[PDB]
Design a protein around this ligand. Structure first.
Ligand SMILES: O=C([O-])C(=O)[O-]
Ligand SMILES: O=C([O-])C(=O)[O-]
Ligand SMILES: O=C([O-])C(=O)[O-]
Ligand SMILES: [Cl-]
Ligand SMILES: [Cl-]
Ligand SMILES: [Cl-]
Ligand SMILES: [Mg+2]
Ligand SMILES: [Mg+2]
Ligand SMILES: [Mg+2]
Ligand SMILES: [Zn+2]
Ligand SMILES: [Zn+2]
Ligand SMILES: [Zn+2]
Lengths: 597, 596, 597
């Protein structure tokens, strides 16, 4: 029956395509099935996971600090496909390689493999459970730390959530297999990081409190984001009880010379270890990573070659190959990095529908400051409102818009607020001067009014008086922390409304999903109950179903594999229905679905 | 299995089309034929029971004394033979027999057998001609079933041995034939005797025909004059005929002609007379109505929907012309129409085999092609790239006949003159350059054969010069062809067909082999593969089953199978396609090869 | 400028098609053009035209009677193609053969080549002038009578017209070249034929008064149309001044045995000659014609083989071939008959778009009694309304309607009334009883209300009272001649109308056209203005234009033959025009026309 359901899905998509895929380019026909590399050996070597179990967090941070080799985080499973393929990478492809990482690269610090947009996108667009994805990775890689991106008070969403909800989700994140929380507030406002960090320590997990990098410390004329700004914030996050400090260079704006100064002062300001995250939009980000190493940074992020470069992280294989034989050599087999790259490359080819038209490097990023993760999002969106031809003015729009809001930190969610503003500015031909004008009738987005009201929090100086006094149009503003002014959700009451809605008891993880994404979880559950475990299908099947005569092997369960052949399709019938003719484990099956077209 | 076989056919044709159909016009995707509603009664005794009571001699007398003209319906033979390449199926013919039986019990006969039907049924329609006959016999047990029998030529195109003609007739009668219209392609009485005697030994009706050619009222063409027709009549009576027929195979007999002819026929012989014509001129009905006013005993017509042009003239109107008169035939005009509206719905299913003939042509009086040739020869000429010179071909046919002495042109002589004419247009040959001694030609296998004496002998006998040229060495003969041909060893020619089909066959099955060795063999093969395909309705037999379509088929009477084409696979790697069926609510999958 | 207009026509048709053809079957591509038969060279022999001019109409009638040979009227140029090709035969093909008829068949009585539906269809569907077509025929056949069908008070229209319009039209037709006017009333009402008859006599032309035939005089269960009905009407028509009596068997109903009695009784009831017209729908009309011949009829109509049979007249070659050597041998060389029929066959292949799917004779005609020239039309109108599968019920409803009307003569325009009636009964599923039912509302067609009102005149025993009273909804019927209630047309004023609308003087022939068909004529004149003398185009070019690369020869005048090549056709420009690139006589011409798609 769970099989009946999978046939139903396969039929529904063989006849009607997938909505996210049907509109876009399709993979090369000949196409190798990606092949998981045969692991050399039997057991897996103890690594950083077992160390955090022995040491606990504080002592684990200290261990990084004293460690001489540079430690590595692989982002391929998260920021990587988020940046190059709109976060569409499936569990099937992700989980399947975890064990290979475990055997072939036991020295790694962590796998960045959860959080960010994956939580939203897995359900909403990939019709699979992100907690299930996490478990599968936990299972395959019991020797590596598992890393998530946590948007501080925004959680895995886009608006600040009630304190008890941040508290609750973190508790669940932990029980699900998350070892390492890279947490960050989108305005670098510490006072809005406390509840989150405190919750991470309380579950006795790693609190890597991030500081988002913007501007240019070596430019005297841009004084707001100088070196003293960062060094204080580092000291402040230590006070607030970080186990590790990260520099989140979300836009890939930190330049090598700047690293060399920054990571020296940072290590001078705190004893806690330092972890550097950048994106490679400039085409120079590896330089900034290598500069950060020489200056003594304890840990860096990179993506597998095959999903590296451009708006992603810089190239893991080449960064490692650069350090090879150096005092700080991170002891990672290049041969194995390359076998895993060849696999991710074959995985990548299956997601052709989601490839951007981005050609290569751009120093334009120093002007606009858009985050690696955004960029392509905003460009398709600017396509959507008919602006593909005016894109470079939409980049000027973004930068003026930034200076308008007072020269702010721009990252999820804050970035989207700037994005939504830039698109309007171009569309309705508003200068920043026409934007802030008394006599000019502007109708701001539901996300601009929201942030000016005080919902993403508060920057250092506060918001600009005038821009806000127009943008609120009578709604009075608040400067207090958004979690303080939101009632503490009655958890036991919300769990009845979702359990009644679905006429069943949901798991504690499931209640977390609904808490973060009420409507999206509900739509996913209904899809779940209708199509079943769609996540066990290999990717070409999940997006295009089965060709005529195509044999499929699918493992609904454990060691229960199913042999599904699509042997024919019928014409559309009097009832508007189509019948797909499956052979399942040598047995005939007839499945009817609607001709939606 | 019986069912499995058919499903394989439906798959092969659904996928590959039918070879005789796939490149020609389709019917309007848009009315299945409906057998008209049963009137409840049992069936009135007719001519069949009368024949059984009187015997053929006295039955023949009884036609003579009948005052009402008697009628023979040809829709089931000459009619589709002439308009549809003889391609009408058993399914459509059998299904209406019972309606004729109940609704027109006055009919003399149904002409429903022989002619091209024996051949074509197996060769292009994958059905048994004897089964067709038997089902018509069962539907209409009260009417005479009439075959056209080409004399020494049987159901074939060449003179057969005496013993084989003996054998075939014997089986025809076992199979349900009551009335043998027997003719000879050169009106050669010597060559008719073997048939005639075999028809009388079976105690069936021998209707000995005279083919009509020329124009009896044109003094400038004095070969084919009255005496000629009224002498042959007296000869055929003395040969022991029960009826005489005029076979106007090409529609040449004119009304003024009929009137003289039929009076004088009746004066020469006491036997009844039966008139057959085609309407290629557009006036044959007036020849038929002339013939009646002159006392003719019986006439042929076809149902309205398959009448006109190269077919017989229109039954329904001819009857209506008579209605109320002293010779009124007593046939209900509403039932005629009902049956015609059936043949009309039937006929639309055979769109693939329609000619492009627009109407009447007085040209027939020039060329003299038989109705049941005309289209055949326009198609074989399109097949020699000549469609733009068809009128030069008709002139050649006329010139060719003059060349052969001025002969009777009916099957299979008609083909012989066709084959020559078609050569003359292509190879650009005047009859002067055809009989020329300096110009070297290569005559058809048909024409060499007729001139050596294989189809018989014209009254003069053949022109020497044409003979001794074509004969290129070969010494001709002037005797009866079967007098020469070795009496086939029937026991021995039986085993050769039984060791090749690896089973016993019936006397009827043997008869088909004797007439068509190579054709029966190919039909038996397919029958064991695809099964009783005769029982499939006619849009399925030619085009298979469209998607989601639901069909109904009676394998065995009181055993109907519901067959539904639910799906058709794309081709597989090994070159096969899989049709997915539902037979009586059970799923079946049938693999058929792709011959594209 | 005339050449410019033809090119514009050729362009339009080439790039948009011809409305009447573009969605029907096309002629065979190979298509041999029609060849006019080469003439032996011998002069044109005086014939029935010279005789009429010498004797005048009364003594010409007398000369017909006394003639021993049967006389033939060829119908190919009018009823042939009206009945088989929806009257779409063109002047180009028709006129080009007149001189052959004249040289080859000089004994002919007449060519039936004008009136009936041709007057209308020529303007409306062929964009050509019927006066022109007649002149061309007159010019080609100076030795033969030219014969029209004139619908008594209905003219060449579908309704009774004021008397003075009827007089005017007949005056123009005599001027235009008509020698022999077959005139008929749709209800055999002589009172309603006198104006027509008198007008024909006043022009000194042959007045062939028709009695329409229906029923079965030999069937005493149908007494209304018995032998004395026919013989009495002949006597009355003689008293009204006919020079010739016709029997118009417009549905081919007369059987041979009835002909024997009818024509002997007619030649005894009146000394005038008798002319017999019938259709071959039944499949036996040749039998009936040869019987009329045997009985002493004076003239019979037939159609050339290639447009005979079925709903047309019966075959001329075979009729003659059957009379040949007889006492009444008509003296027509059938060799030449066949040569001319062969031309007509080639002409006919060009009109494949207009062929019907009639397969042959139908004894069903004795039941429905549909005129030959209505049949196909009505069968299409029924298709039009979704009634193809039910044709046979329309034919039965037509019979029933005919009896519901009291049992009436069905011919243009009464036949159309009965058809509207049948169609409605079948669409709406009404028996005759329902139709006259007190509790059942019926909205009768206008042609039916109007007939029962009296507009088509009076049948011998009046209209059935109860049907009439229900059909008219309180309107009062009348029993006078319809034309006695119509305003005299103010001729001088109406001429000033059409002359103001066209901004030029018109001819008397054009004005008679206007008087018969105001809207249609006005459209035709406007078209002539735009497209020039399109009647001079050969028929394939008229309906399909020119293929790419095609060379066409065309005579706008005797000494001037245009050579036209289609060299290229453009894509559709931004103004929605397409530019066709022609060569005219070696010179480049470019014609823009609209893309109408
Ligand atoms: O999706 C995110 O939160 C990101 O990477 O900034
Ligand atoms: O088959 C035949 O012999 C025929 O119809 O002439
Ligand atoms: O057009 C006509 O009047 C006719 O022939 O019925
Ligand atoms: Cl949601
Ligand atoms: Cl054979
Ligand atoms: Cl009008
Ligand atoms: Mg370190
Ligand atoms: Mg008799
Ligand atoms: Mg006379
Ligand atoms: Zn990132
Ligand atoms: Zn025949
Ligand atoms: Zn007519």
């Amino acid at each position: 029956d769970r099989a009946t359901k999978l046939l139903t899905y396969l039929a529904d998509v063989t006849v009607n395509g997938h909505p996210e895929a049907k509109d876009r380019p399709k993979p090369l026909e000949n196409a190798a099935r990606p092949v998981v590399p045969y692991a050399n050996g039997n057991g897996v070597k103890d690594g950083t996971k077992q160390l955090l179990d022995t040491l606990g967090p504080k002592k684990f941070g200290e261990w990084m600090r004293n460690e001489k080799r540079v430690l590595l985080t692989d982002t391929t499973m998260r920021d990587g496909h988020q940046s190059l393929l709109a976060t569409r990478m499936r569990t099937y492809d992700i989980a399947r390689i975890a064990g290979t990482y475990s055997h072939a690269l036991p020295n790694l610090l962590s796998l960045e493999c959860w959080g960010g947009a994956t939580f939203d996108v897995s359900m909403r667009f990939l019709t699979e459970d992100p907690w299930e994805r996490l478990a599968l990775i936990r299972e395959g890689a019991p020797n590596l730390l598992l890393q998530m991106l946590l948007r501080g008070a925004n959680g895995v969403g886009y608006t600040n959530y009630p304190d008890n909800v941040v508290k609750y989700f973190v508790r669940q994140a932990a029980k699900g297999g998350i070892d390492l929380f890279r947490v960050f507030d989108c305005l670098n406002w510490v006072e809005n990081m406390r509840v989150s960090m405190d919750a991470i320590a309380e579950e006795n997990k790693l609190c890597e409190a991030a500081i988002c990098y913007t501007g240019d410390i070596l430019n005297s004329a841009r004084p707001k984001y100088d070196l003293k700004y960062y060094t204080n914030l580092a000291v402040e996050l230590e006070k607030a009880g970080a186990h590790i400090i990260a520099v989140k260079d979300m836009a890939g704006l930190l330049k090598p010379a700047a690293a060399k100064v920054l990571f020296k002062a940072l290590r001078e300001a705190t004893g806690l270890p330092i972890h550097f995250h950048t994106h490679d939009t400039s085409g120079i980000a590896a330089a900034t990573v290598l500069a950060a190493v020489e200056a003594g940074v304890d840990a860096v992020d990179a993506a597998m070659d095959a999903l590296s470069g451009n708006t992603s992280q810089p190239c893991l294989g080449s960064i490692v190959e650069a350090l090879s034989g150096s005092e700080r050599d991170p002891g990672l087999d290049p041969a194995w990095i390359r076998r895993i790259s060849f696999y991710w490359e074959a995985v990548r080819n299956q997601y052709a529908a989601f490839e951007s038209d981005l050609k290569g490097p751009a120093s334009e990023v120093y002007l606009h400051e858009m985050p690696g993760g955004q960029f392509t999002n905003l460009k398709e969106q600017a396509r959507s409102l008919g602006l593909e031809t005016r894109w470079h003015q939409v980049a000027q729009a973004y930068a003026d818009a930034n200076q308008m809001f007072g020269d702010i930190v721009k990252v999820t969610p804050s970035s989207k607020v700037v994005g939504d503003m830039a698109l309007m500015m171009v569309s309705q031909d508003l200068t920043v001067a026409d934007v802030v004008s008394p006599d000019r009738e502007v109708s701001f987005p539901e996300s601009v009014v929201s942030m000016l009201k005080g919902d993403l929090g508060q920057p250092p100086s506060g918001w600009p008086e005038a821009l806000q006094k127009k943008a609120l149009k009578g709604e009075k503003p608040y400067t207090v922390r958004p979690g303080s002014l939101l009632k503490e959700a009655d958890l036991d009451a919300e769990r009845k409304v979702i359990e009644k809605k679905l006429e069943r008891e949901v798991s504690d993880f499931e209640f977390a999903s609904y808490l973060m994404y009420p409507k999206v979880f509900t739509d996913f559950a209904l899809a779940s109950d209708t199509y079943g475990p769609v996540s066990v299908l290999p990717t070409p099947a999940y997006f295009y179903g089965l060709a005529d005569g195509e044999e499929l092997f699918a493992d609904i369960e454990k060691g229960k594999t199913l042999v599904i052949v699509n042997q024919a399709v019928s014409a559309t019938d009097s009832q508007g229905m189509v019948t797909v003719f499956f052979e399942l484990n040598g047995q005939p099956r007839r499945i009817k679905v609607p001709d939606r077209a």
